[PDB]
A paper describes a structure:
Recognition of N-linked glycan at residue N276 (glycan276) at the periphery of the CD4-binding site (CD4bs) on the [name]-envelope trimer is a formidable challenge for many CD4bs-directed antibodies. The glycan at residue N276 (glycan276), in particular, has been found to restrict antibody access to the CD4bs, an important site of vulnerability targeted by many broadly neutralizing antibodies isolated from chronically [name]-infected patients. Cryo-electron microscopy (cryo-EM) structures of these two antibodies and 179NC75, a previously identified glycan276-dependent CD4bs antibody, in complex with [name]-envelope trimer reveal substantially different modes of glycan276 recognition. Despite these differences, binding of glycan276-dependent antibodies maintains a glycan276 conformation similar to that observed in the absence of glycan276-binding antibodies.
Neutralization assessment indicated [name].01 to neutralize most of the glycan276-bearing strains of the 208-isolate panel; to visualize how [name].01 interacts with glycan276, we determined a cryo-EM structure of [name] trimer [name] SOSIPv5.2 in complex with the antigen-binding fragment (Fab) of [name].01 and an [name] base-binding [name] Fab at 3.3 Å. The density for the constant domains of [name].01 in the [name] SOSIPv5.2 complex tapered off quickly, and only the variable domains were modeled in the refined structure. Hereafter, except for figures illustrating both variable and constant domains of [name].01, we used the [name] [name].v5.2 complex to analyze [name].01-[name] binding because its higher resolution provided greater definition of interactions. [name].01 bound an epitope overlapping the CD4bs and used both heavy and light chains to interact with glycan276. Heavy-chain interactions accounted for ~70% of the epitope. The [name].01 heavy chain bound at virtually the same location as the N-terminal domain of CD4 D1D2 and made extensive contact with the CD4-binding loop, the D loop, and the β23/V5/β24 region. All three CDRs of the heavy chain hydrogen-bonded with residues in the D loop, with Arg50 forming a salt bridge with Asp457 in the gp120 V5 loop. Glycan276 was recognized about equally by both heavy and light chains of [name].01, interacting with CDR H3 and CDR L1-L3. Specifically, the CDR H3 formed interactions with the two protein-proximal N-acetylglucosamines and some of the mannoses, while CDR L1-L3 formed contacts with protein-distal mannoses. The five-residue FR H3 insertion contacted C1, C4, and C5 regions of gp120, with interactions including a hydrogen bond between the backbone nitrogen of Trp72CHC and the amide oxygen of Gln428gp120 and a cation-π sandwich of Trp72CHC side chain between Arg72DHC and His105gp120.
Author numbering:
A (entry chain H): 2 to 52, 52A, 53 to 72, 72A, 72B, 72C, 72D, 72E, ...
B (entry chain A): 31 to 141, 150 to 185, 189 to 309, 312 to 323, 323A, 324 to 397, 412 to 506
C (entry chain B), E (entry chain I), F (entry chain G): 518 to 663
D (entry chain L): 1 to 107
G (entry chain F): 190 to 242
H (entry chain E): 137 to 141, 150 to 185, 189
The structure:
C-alpha cells in the first residue's frame, strides 16, 4: 500500500490550489480516502473524505463553498486510482501541510487513518 | 463391505460452476424490422419460441450475484458493440479549430441564459484548395473558452468521432443463451437477496429479455420485484458498497427536450459529412423530467420500511442529494430519444423519515466520453423536432454516508459506481454451469467376459 | 429435446439412471448448432463475417462442444464401452473411495451428492478402468481363452 | 462539534521511565478515539485504532484505555524514539476533530 | 472415394442398400479436408490468414461437416446401433406411416421416393426408437433377463 | 497422459502392441485443448480476439486434430471394428505385400520398419477390408446364415 | 477550371499497378456433406424436370 | 562538452510542427543522430 503526493506549491492569494494523491496496491474502490490539513501552530484539522466507488464527497462544514474533492478510476485496473483536491480562495491562513490518507480496514463509517502520504505543502 | 464393481454411466445430471461465453439472442418480431438497430443486428439468433423452463425438484444451489461473471460479460460486450458501430463513421478531426462564439439571446428564458453558444469557424471543404465559413450552435458544456475564442473540449486528448446518423442505439431487449454443454440455472425464490442457498431452481435455455439501458442513479425500464421492495448489497453495513434497490411497482417519469431544433449537414470532405445544429425554431427553454409527487413518496415509504430491517426500526432515515466535483457523479445520466441528458435529481432525494408533480431541471450534451475512457470521444448529432420519452423507474442506486451522530440516523444519497451495477440488477437470478455427464458408482454387475 | 434436461438432478441415483438419454441429447445441440444446419441460409451469417471477432467467438463455442463430446467418447472407448449409456466393468470397488452399501446410495443419494463425495478418487478409478481393458485385450489374444 | 482536550501540554521524562497522555471529550464519544504519533517531517503514525485496541505494526510499548469521555494513551518503557508529539482524534459525530496535542520532552 | 457417390440414387431401395459405404465415406472428406491434411504445408494458407473473412468461411464449412456427422452418429448410438450401416430394432411398423407390402417397396421404390412418402412421420419414428432402447436397458438391468 | 507417448517406437511390433492406449490418448488432447476446457476463463482468450489472425491459427489446429481423429474412426467403423484397439478381419494376407513369417515380424521388426516395408500396399489392403465388410453384411441379411 | 467527377460523393482509390484483374477460369466446389447436381440435357431452357442428371 | 570521437555525431534540429488545434503551428526542436538525417540542397 502506497500513497504518492504531488510536490509543494505556492499561489497568489485568492487563487485556487490543486493537489493530488495517487494510490496503489490495494483496491482503490472500497476504503474511503480522507484529507487532513496540518498547521504547525494549530494541530491537525479534518477537511473531508471521498467515496472512491461512488464519486461522492463529504466535507467538513467550513469548506463547503471552497473545497472540492474528485476521484479518477478505471474499472480495467482496480488496484490503481487517484484522488484530487481543489481548494478555492487560498489565503495565508491556509498555509499548511496537506495530507492524504486511508481509513483502517473495517472503518469506512468512521475515519482512523492507517496509511498516509507525504504532505503537499501549500504556501 | 459388499462385493461390488465399478459401473460406468454416461448422461449423468451433474454440474460444476463455470465461466464461458454466452452467445445472445433476440425475439425476431417487431425488432426484426428495426434494421439499423445495433442490438437487433448483433443478437441475431431468434429465440423465445415459448422457451422452456424446467423446474428442478429438491435442488438447492448457491448463488452469488456479486461474483456473477455474466454481468462482466454483458458489460464487455456492450462496450465492444459501441466501439464497432462508431469505428466506421466520419471522424471529425477538422472541427478542432478556433471557434468565434457569441451568446444566443433569441427568445431565451432566464434559465437558458448562457446555455447556448453561436459559433462560426473556417471548415475544410470537399475540394482541397478551398475553405468555407460555417456556423453551428453548441451547448455550453461542449466548449472551452480559451485566451469570444473557443475550442471543443476534446482537443487536448482525443479525436472526436460522430455517431453515424442511421445507427440506432435503442435498448431493445436481448436474451443471453448458453452454448451446448452448458446450462443456465435460474433462482426463483421471491425475496431472494442475491446470495446463498436458493431452494427453488429451474433451468432455462436463455435469460429473460433484458434491456441494456445505460444510466446512473435511477435504473430505468428493468424488471420489478415480485412482492416487496428489495434491498440488495454485497455488504449492507459497509458504506463503500452500493445498495441496489428494486421497486415492486414502477414510478413513471416523463422527460422532454423542448425547442423545435433543425439540422443541417456540411461537407467536410469527399462524401464526409458533419451534422450541425441550426437555428432553433420557436422559443428556447430547458429540458426537464416530470415525476409524480405522490408516487415519489409512497415508493420511498416502501424503501424506508425495508431499510429499517437492516439499520434499526428506531433509526432516522434521511435522503439527500449527490455531492461531488463532476457532472457525471451528480446527475441522472441517460439517453432519451437519441440525445444525452444529465438531469438534476435533488428534487427527488430530499426527505426525512422518523416513524401534482416534481420537475427536475435537466441539461444536455453532444460530446460524450462514454464509459470510463480518457481518449475516445463521440459527437452525438442533433435530432430535429422535439423529444419526448416515457420511462419506468424500476430501481435506485444508493449509498450511505457513514455513521452520523448519537441521534442514530442514516443518510442515503444517489450513488455512482460502475455501469456493471445496472446489469447486476437483472442478472442476479442467473448462474452458469458446465455439465459433466460421466460418472461411476458401485453395482452388483460384472462385465461378463465372452 | 430439452423437455426435462436436468429434471432428475434432485432425484435419487437410481431414478436418475433412467433418464440418461435426456442429458446426452443436449451435449451437441445448442441453438446455434440448429441454426447452422437450416436448409435456408440463416441470414445472420453476414454479421459474423463483417465483424470477425464475433465469428471467432461463435466458432470457439462450437469447436469446444465437439471436443468435449469426443473426449468423453474416447474414454468410454478406451475403457471397453463403445456405445451404451450404462456398462459394467471388471474393476472392483475399493470401499475406501466410498464406504456405503447399495441400498444407501442408489436410494438415498442424488448424483450431485455422490459426485461431491468421490471427486478426488476420480483419477484413480479412471486409471484402473484403463488397466482393466488392457488386461482384457491381453487375454483375448490367447486362443485358449479362460 | 466535539472538542477534545489533552493534558498535560507537555511531559518531561527520561528513557526507561513510563509516560501517559490524558484526553477528554466535551461530549460522549463511546469508544471512537484514536491516537497518533507525530514527528517533524513525517505524516502522523496511527498507534491506536479505537479506545484500547492498538494498530498493526505498533510495539508492545503502547496500549490505550478509557471510554465515553475519559481516554488515556499508555506508554511503557519509553524509548528515545518516542519523544514525539501525540494527538487524540474524535471520530464519533463528524467532522473529525483533533485535540491540541501534547509533547514528550527530554529532561 | 467418390467413384459412384450417388450412383444408386435412381435405383431401388433394395439395390441401393448395397452401396451404403459409398455415401458414408464422403461425409467427412471434401477437397479442403484433404488439402488440410497434407504432410507439406498447403501453401494457400497464408491467403486465409491475411484475409480473415475467407479463413472464417472455410472453418465454418469444416466445423459444420463435423457437427452433422456427429449428430447422426449420436442418434445411432442412442437408438442402440453403435456402428453398423444396417441395424434391426424392436419398433413395429405402424401401417399408417406407410401402408405398402415389402415386395412393393424394396423392389419398386427408390429411396428418394420413400423419403417423400414418410417424411412427416420421421419424428414419431425417431421418438419410438429412443423409447425402445431405453426399455431395453431397463430390461438388461435384471439378472433374470427374459 | 504422455508418460511414455512414443516409448515403444523402438521396440518390436509384439511388445509395442501392448501400449496402444498410450498413443490413442494423445490424439485429441494437446495443451491448448486442456486450457480451453478449464472451469475458469483461460484469461489469454482476449489476445486471440483482439488479433484475429492468431485466433484463426489456433482454431485451424483444433479443427484438424478433430478431423483426423474422426476419419480414422470412420475407417474402423466401415471395416467392421467399432471400438477395439485390435480387431480381426476376414481378409487373407497376400504374401506379396510382404513375405515374412509371424516369428520374424512380431519379434524382430519395429512398427516403423514395418510401415516402411508395406506402405505402397496400404490402399489395396484398405480397399479389401471395406469389400470384406460389405460382403459380411450381405450375408447377415439372410436368415439361414452359414 | 475543372475537377474530377468523384469529388462530391467519394474518395477515389487507385488500383494497385501490379494487381491483375484478369478473368481466368475458376470452379465452384461443394463442401463435404453437399453435392452439386448438373443438368445434362441439351436444349434445357433453365426450368423444370431435367431427366438427365 | 563533446569529446573528439563525437564531433559531428549529434545534430540539433528545429522545425515547424503541427499542433493539436488545426489552425496553429509550433516551433520545436529535437536532437538527432547523424545516421538518421540527410543533408539536402543547414
Ligand atoms: C461487512 O462489513 C463490515 C464493515 O461494515 C465488516 O465489519 C468489520 O469487521 C472487522 C474485522 O474484520 C472489525 O475490525 C475489528 O474491530 C475491533 C473493534 O471493534 C469494537 O469497536 C468498534 C468501534 O466502532 C465505533 O465507530 C462506529 C462507526 O461510527 C460506531 O457505530 C461504534 O458504536 C463505535 O463508536 C465497534 O463498532 C465494535 O462493535 C461492532 O462489532 C462487534 C463484533 O466485532 C459486534 O458484536 C457489535 O454489536 C458491533 O456490531 C466493537 O465494539 C478492533 O479491536 C479489531 O482490532 C484487533 O484485531 C485485528 C485483527 O486484524 C488486529 O490487527 C488489531 O491489531 C487488533 O488486535 C487486538 O485483538 C486481538 C484479538 O485476537 C489480539 O490478539 C491482539 O494482540 C490485539 O489486542 C479490528 O480492527 C470492524 O470493526 C468491523 N466494522 C464494523 C463497522 O462493524 C464485516 O466483517 C463484513 N462482513 C463480511 C462477511 O465481509
Ligand atoms: C423506456 O421504454 C420506453 C418504451 O419503449 C422508451 O420510449 C420509446 O422510445 C423510442 C425511441 O426514442 C420512441 O420511438 C420514436 O418515436 C418517434 C415518435 O413517433 C410517433 O409518431 C409516429 C407516427 O408519425 C408513431 O408511429 C409512433 O408510434 C409515435 O407515436 C419516432 O419519430 C421515432 O422514429 C425515428 O427515429 C428512429 C430511431 O430508432 C428511426 O429508426 C426511425 O426510422 C425514425 O427516424 C427517421 O425519421 C426522423 C424524423 O424525420 C429523422 O430525424 C431520422 O434521421 C430518420 O430519417 C421513433 O420511432 C418511442 O415512441 C418511445 N415510446 C413512448 C411510449 O414514449 C424509452 O425511451 C425507454 N427509456 C430508456 C431510458 O431507454
Ligand atoms: C448565429 O449567427 C449567424 C451569423 O454568423 C446568424 O445568421 C445571420 O442572421 C442575420 C439576421 O439576424 C442575417 O442578416 C439578414 O439577412 C437577410 C437576408 O436573408 C437581409 O434581408 C437582412 O437585411 C440582413 O442582412 C445574416 O445573413 C445571417 N448570416 C448567415 C451566415 O446565415 C444566426 O441567425 C445566429 N443564430 C442564433 C441562434 O443566434
Ligand atoms: C477565416 O480566415 C480568415 C483569413 O483567411 C480570417 O480573417 C482574418 O482574421 C485576422 C485575425 O486573425 C485579421 O487580421 C484579418 O484582417 C482577417 N482578414 C479578412 C479578409 O477578414 C477569418 O476571421 C477566419 N474566420 C473564422 C470564423 O475564424
Ligand atoms: C441473505 O439471507 C441469508 C439468510 O437466508 C443471509 O445469510 C446468513 O446471515 C447471518 C447473519 O445475519 C449468518 O449468521 C448466517 O450463518 C447466514 N446464513 C448463510 C446460509 O450464509 C445473507 O447474509 C443475506 N445476504 C445479504 C446480502 O444480506
Ligand atoms: C411537466 O409539468 C409542467 C407543469 O408543472 C408542464 O408545463 C405546462 O404545460 C402546459 C401545456 O403546454 C402549459 O399550458 C402550462 O402553462 C405549463 N406549466 C408551467 C408551470 O410551465 C410540462 O409540460 C410537463 N413536462 C412534461 C415532459 O410533460
Ligand atoms: C406522463 O404523460 C402521460 C400521458 O402520456 C400522463 O397521463 C395522462 O394524465 C391525464 C390526467 O392529467 C389523463 O386524463 C390521461 O388519460 C393520461 N394519459 C395516459 C395515456 O395515461 C401522465 O400523468 C404524465 N406523468 C407525469 C408525472 O406528469
Ligand atoms: C444539493 O442540495 C443543496 C441544497 O440542499 C445545493 O446547495 C446550493 O448550491 C448552490 C450552488 O450550486 C448555492 O448557490 C446555494 O446557495 C446552495 N443552497 C444552500 C441552501 O446553501 C447543492 O448544490 C446540491 N448539489 C447538487 C450536485 O446539485
Ligand atoms: C439542482 O436543483 C436544486 C433545486 O432547484 C438547485 O438548488 C437551488 O438553486 C437556486 C439557484 O439557481 C437557489 O436560489 C435555491 O435556493 C437552491 N435550492 C435550495 C434548496 O438550496 C441546485 O443549485 C441544482 N444543482 C446544480 C448543480 O445546479
Ligand atoms: C427540501 O425540503 C425543504 C423542506 O423540508 C425545502 O425548503 C422549503 O421550501 C419552501 C418553498 O417551496 C419554503 O416556503 C420553506 O420555508 C422551506 N423550508 C425550509 C426548512 O427550508 C427545500 O427547498 C427542498 N430542497 C430542494 C432541493 O427542493
Ligand atoms: C411500466 O410498467 C407497467 C407495469 O408492468 C407496464 O405495463 C404492462 O406491460 C405488460 C407487458 O410487459 C402487459 O402485459 C400489462 O398488461 C401492462 N400493464 C398495464 C397496467 O398496462 C408498462 O408498459 C411499463 N412502461 C414502460 C415504458 O416500460
Ligand atoms: C423430491 O423429494 C420428495 C421427497 O423425498 C420425493 O417424493 C417421493 O415421490 C415418490 C413418487 O411419487 C413417492 O413414491 C415417495 O413416497 C415420495 N417420498 C416421500 C418421502 O414421500 C420426490 O419424488 C423428489 N423429486 C424428484 C424429481 O425425484
Ligand atoms: C434404371 O431403370 C431401368 C428400368 O427399370 C433398370 O433396368 C433393369 O436392369 C437390371 C440389371 O441389368 C435388369 O435385370 C432388369 O430387367 C432391368 N429392368 C427392366 C424393366 O428391363 C436400371 O437398372 C435402372 N438403373 C439403376 C442404376 O438401377
Ligand atoms: C532396445 O534393444 C535391446 C536389444 O535388442 C532390447 O533388449 C532386450 O530387453 C529384454 C527385456 O529386458 C531382454 O529380455 C532381451 O534379452 C534384451 N535383448 C538382448 C539382445 O539382450 C531393448 O528391450 C530394446 N528397447 C525397447 C524399448 O524395447
Ligand atoms: C516556420 O515558418 C516561418 C514562416 O511562417 C519561417 O520564417 C520565414 O522564413 C523565410 C525563409 O524561408 C523568410 O524569408 C521569412 O522572413 C521568415 N519569416 C519570419 C517571420 O521570420 C520559419 O523559418 C520556419 N521555422 C522553421 C524552424 O523552419
Ligand atoms: C454571454 O456569456 C457571458 C458569460 O460567459 C456573460 O458574462 C455575458 O453577459 C453574456 N452575454 C449576453 C448577451 O447574454
Ligand atoms: C489543455 O487544457 C487546458 C484547460 O484545462 C488549457 O489551458 C491548455 O491550453 C490545453 N492544452 C493545449 C496544448 O492546448
Ligand atoms: C410523504 O410522506 C411523509 C411521511 O412522514 C409525509 O409527512 C409527507 O407529507 C408525504 N408527502 C406528500 C407529498 O404526500
Ligand atoms: C477428498 O475428498 C473428501 C470428501 O469427503 C474431503 O473431505 C477431503 O478433504 C478431500 N481431500 C483433499 C486433499 O482435498
Ligand atoms: C404428410 O405427408 C403426406 C405424404 O403423402 C402429404 O400428402 C400430407 O399433406 C402431409 N401432411 C401435412 C400436414 O403436410
Ligand atoms: C514399393 O515399396 C517397396 C518397398 O520395399 C520399394 O522398394 C518400391 O520401390 C516401391 N515402389 C514404388 C513404385 O515406389
Ligand atoms: C559541423 O559538421 C560539418 C560536417 O557536416 C563540419 O564541416 C563543421 O566544421 C561542423 N561544425 C562544428 C562547429 O563542429
Amino acid at each position: 500500500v502506497q500513497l504518492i503526493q504531488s510536490g509543494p506549491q505556492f499561489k497568489t492569494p485568492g487563487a485556487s490550489v490543486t493537489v493530488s494523491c495517487k494510490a496503489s496496491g490495494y483496491i482503490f474502490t472500497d476504503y474511503l480516502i480522507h484529507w487532513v490539513r496540518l498547521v504547525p501552530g494549530k494541530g491537525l484539522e479534518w477537511l473531508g473524505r471521498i467515496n472512491t466507488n461512488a464519486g461522492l464527497m463529504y466535507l467538513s462544514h467550513k469548506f463547503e463553498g471552497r473545497l472540492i474533492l474528485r476521484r479518477v478510476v478505471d474499472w480495467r485496473t482496480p488496484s490503481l486510482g487517484t484522488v484530487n483536491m481543489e481548494l478555492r480562495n487560498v489565503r495565508s491562513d491556509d498555509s499548511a501541510i496537506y495530507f492524504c490518507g486511508r481509513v483502517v480496514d473495517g472503518f469506512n463509517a468512521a475515519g482512523p487513518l492507517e496509511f498516509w502520504g507525504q504532505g503537499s505543502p501549500v504556501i | 463391505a459388499e462385493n461390488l464393481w465399478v459401473t460406468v454411466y454416461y448422461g449423468v445430471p451433474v454440474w460444476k460452476d463455470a465461466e464461458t461465453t454466452l452467445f445472445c439472442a433476440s425475439d425476431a418480431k417487431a425488432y426484426e424490422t428495426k434494421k439499423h438497430n445495433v442490438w437487433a443486428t448483433h443478437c441475431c439468433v431468434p429465440t423465445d419460441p415459448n422457451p422452456q423452463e424446467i423446474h428442478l425438484e429438491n435442488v438447492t444451489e448457491e448463488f452469488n450475484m456479486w461474483k456473477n461473471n455474466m454481468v462482466e460479460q454483458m458489460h464487455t460486450d456492450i462496450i465492444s458493440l459501441w466501439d464497432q458501430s462508431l469505428k466506421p463513421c466520419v471522424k471529425l478531426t477538422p472541427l478542432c479549430v478556433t471557434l468565434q462564439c457569441t451568446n444566443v439571446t433569441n427568445n431565451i428564458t432566464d434559465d437558458m441564459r448562457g446555455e447556448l453558444k453561436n459559433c462560426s469557424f473556417n471548415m475544410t471543404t470537399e475540394l482541397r484548395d478551398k475553405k468555407q465559413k460555417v456556423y453551428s450552435l453548441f451547448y455550453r458544456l461542449d466548449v472551452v473558452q480559451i485566451n469570444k475564442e473557443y475550442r471543443l473540449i476534446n482537443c487536448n486528448t482525443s479525436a472526436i468521432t460522430q455517431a453515424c446518423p442511421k445507427v440506432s442505439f435503442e435498448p431493445i431487449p436481448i436474451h443471453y443463451c448458453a452454448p451446448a454443454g452448458f446450462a443456465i440455472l435460474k433462482c426463483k425464490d421471491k425475496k431472494f437477496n442475491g446470495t446463498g442457498p436458493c431452494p427453488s431452481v429451474s433451468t432455462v435455455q436463455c435469460t429473460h429479455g433484458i434491456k441494456p439501458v445505460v444510466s446512473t442513479q435511477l435504473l430505468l425500464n428493468g424488471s420489478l420485484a415480485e412482492e416487496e421492495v428489495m434491498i440488495r448489497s454485497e455488504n449492507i453495513t459497509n458504506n463503500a458498497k452500493n445498495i441496489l434497490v428494486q421497486f415492486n411497482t414502477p414510478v413513471q417519469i416523463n422527460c422532454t427536450r423542448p425547442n423545435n431544433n433543425t439540422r443541417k449537414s456540411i461537407r467536410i470532405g469527399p462524401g464526409q459529412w458533419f451534422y450541425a445544429t441550426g437555428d432553433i425554431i420557436g422559443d428556447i427553454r430547458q429540458a426537464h423530467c416530470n415525476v409524480s409527487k405522490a408516487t415519489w413518496n409512497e415508493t420511498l415509504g416502501k424503501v424506508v420500511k425495508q431499510l429499517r430491517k437492516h439499520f434499526g426500526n428506531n433509526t432516522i432515515i434521511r435522503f439527500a442529494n449527490s455531492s461531488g466535483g463532476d457532472l457525471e457523479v451528480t446527475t441522472h445520466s441517460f439517453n432519451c430519444g437519441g440525445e444525452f441528458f444529465y438531469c438534476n435529481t435533488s428534487g427527488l432525494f430530499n426527505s426525512t423519515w422518523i416513524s401534482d408533480s416534481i420537475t427536475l431541471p435537466c441539461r444536455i450534451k453532444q460530446i460524450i466520453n462514454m464509459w470510463q475512457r480518457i481518449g475516445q470521444a463521440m459527437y452525438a448529432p442533433p435530432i430535429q423536432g422535439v423529444i419526448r420519452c416515457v420511462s419506468n423507474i424500476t430501481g435506485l442506486i444508493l449509498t450511505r454516508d457513514g455513521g452520523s451522530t448519537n441521534s442514530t440516523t442514516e443518510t442515503f444519497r444517489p450513488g455512482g459506481g460502475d455501469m456493471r451495477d445496472n446489469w447486476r440488477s437483472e442478472l442476479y437470478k442467473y448462474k452458469v454451469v458446465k455439465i459433466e455427464p460421466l460418472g461411476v458408482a458401485p453395482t452388483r454387475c460384472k462385465r461378463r467376459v465372452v | 429435446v430439452f423437455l426435462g434436461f436436468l429434471g432428475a438432478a434432485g432425484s435419487t441415483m437410481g431414478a436418475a439412471s433412467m433418464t440418461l438419454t435426456v442429458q446426452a441429447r443436449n451435449l451437441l445441440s445448442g441453438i446455434v448448432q440448429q441454426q447452422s444446419n437450416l436448409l435456408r441460409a440463416p441470414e445472420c451469417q453476414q454479421h459474423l463475417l463483417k465483424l470477425t471477432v464475433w465469428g471467432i467467438k461463435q466458432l470457439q463455442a462450437r469447436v469446444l462442444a465437439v471436443e468435449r463430446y469426443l473426449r468423453d467418447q474416447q474414454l468410454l472407448g478406451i475403457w471397453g464401452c463403445s456405445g451404451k449409456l450404462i456398462c459394467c466393468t471388471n474393476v472392483p470397488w475399493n470401499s475406501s473411495w466410498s464406504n456405503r452399501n447399495l441400498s444407501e446410495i442408489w436410494d438415498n443419494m442424488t448424483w450431485l451428492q455422490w459426485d461431491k463425495e468421490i471427486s478426488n478418487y476420480t483419477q484413480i478409478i479412471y486409471g484402473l478402468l484403463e488397466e482393466s481393458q488392457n488386461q482384457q485385450e491381453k487375454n483375448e489374444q490367447d486362443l485358449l481363452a479362460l | 462539534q466535539v472538542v477534545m482536550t489533552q493534558s498535560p501540554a507537555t511531559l518531561s521524562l527520561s528513557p526507561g521511565e513510563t509516560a501517559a497522555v490524558s484526553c477528554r471529550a466535551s461530549q460522549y464519544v463511546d469508544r471512537s478515539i484514536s491516537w497518533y504519533q507525530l514527528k517533524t517531517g513525517r505524516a502522523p503514525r496511527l498507534l491506536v485504532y479505537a479506545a484500547s485496541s492498538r494498530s498493526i505494526g505498533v510495539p508492545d510499548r503502547f496500549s490505550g484505555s478509557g471510554s465515553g469521555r475519559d481516554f488515556t494513551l499508555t506508554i511503557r518503557g519509553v524509548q528515545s524514539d518516542d519523544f514525539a508529539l501525540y494527538y487524540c482524534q474524535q471520530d464519533y459525530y463528524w467532522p473529525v476533530t483533533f485535540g491540541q496535542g501534547t509533547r514528550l520532552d527530554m529532561k
